[PDB]
């Protein structure tokens, strides 16, 4: 259920 | 305008992070935040739901078939790798072996040309390369290297047209290092550090091997992109010599620094172009001789993946769309629409045989809402 780091980059770390 | 897909697959109950396709069978594997991988077919409407792989301890973030088609390798965010052996002409996939050598795997790739081979990188910086035994599918460790001091963000095999005994890998890290490995010996061929890139901080995240026809025969030229807009093109067959190094965008003061992050890189031999896609939505197309921007696209949100195919550049976006551009003219030829959250990954399928007149390519997506869509795209 965790999200890989790239996902947080796409969102610019909400 | 809303949904122009041909068909869909929606059995995941959380985000689809990864999608892979068998090299010779019409078979997709997708991996998701529901800690599952699903197998389904790419040649029918609706897809045949082949089945489901289990045993994961966290989100599945890689689904990769081996080049010769015998095995499927999957990896999750708890550091597990599972190996499944194809059965019954590819209809069933049986667990053959597994391991859990690290806390979290960041990437895993199978070798594109050498059978039964794969590598992966972990959040502790470590790099691993394995083969799979042809008789029982057991894991055979070729190397395990602890050189990168932060997350090993990406890897890319190099020199892939040199035979089964030339097994070489380039990996990169958030600590600004880039390493090339001989996977059979575990030796570090070269290492690029901050001191060799003008002292610049460059947390690397993307890698892409150049086509040999673009590089005058050189099968080891790699483009590298960082999360702060640094682009390096390196010659892995000359000790990591830097062919190009530049910062690809200047941000306005108000902008988050991650706007410069280079998330995906793709090469076009035909146009002598290299495309890079950024979190801010820019897609920059560089001439591969002068390393200057020749053309650009601007999406309304983050690029998630780029892929050249013939005349086209395909670009998936966190706005949920996949764009198809003519690379040379810039024409927006098609937009794959239907997702209501971002596209996180996609594959491109060609008709296997040139029939007698031309059938369409397919784009198959991994969506953040838990859906995969199948699109028939023009040409």
Residue numbers in the entry:
A (entry chain B): 2 to 15
B (entry chain A): 53 to 431
Study authors write:
Next, we co-crystallized the S. cerevisiae and C. thermophilum complexes between the β-propeller domain of Sqt1 and L10-N, which were co-expressed in E. coli and co-purified via Rpl10(1–20)-(His)6 by Ni-affinity chromatography followed by size-exclusion chromatography. Co-structures could be determined at 1.6 Å (S. cerevisiae) and 1.7 Å (C. thermophilum) resolution by molecular replacement using the respective native Sqt1 structures as search models. The Sqt1/L10-N-binding interface comprises ∼700 Å2 of surface area and is established by intricate hydrogen bonding networks, salt bridges and two hydrophobic patches. In the case of S. cerevisiae Sqt1, the amino group of Ala2 is held in place via interactions with the main-chain carbonyl of Gly85 and the side chains of Asn87, Glu110 and Ser111. At the C-terminal end of the L10-N peptide, only Lys13 of S. cerevisiae engages in a contact, involving Asp311, with Sqt1. Sqt1 from S. cerevisiae showed only a slight preference for the L10-N peptide lacking Met1, as indicated by the dissociation constants (Kd) of ∼21 and 43 nM, respectively. We conclude that the Arg10–Glu315 interaction is the main binding determinant and that the Arg3–Glu110/Glu156 and Arg4–Asp420 interactions are individually not strictly required for but clearly contribute to binding.
In the case of Sqt1, we were able to decipher the mode of L10-N peptide binding by X-ray crystallography. These structural analyses showed that the C-terminal domain of Sqt1, which is preceded by a non-essential N-terminal extension of ∼50 amino acids, folds into an eight-bladed WD-repeat β-propeller. Taken together, we propose that Sqt1 may protect Rpl10 from aggregation before and/or promote its incorporation into almost mature pre-60S subunits in the cytoplasm. We conclude that the β-propeller domains of Sqt1 and Rrb1, which harbour the essential function of these proteins, recognize the very N-terminal residues of Rpl10 and Rpl3.
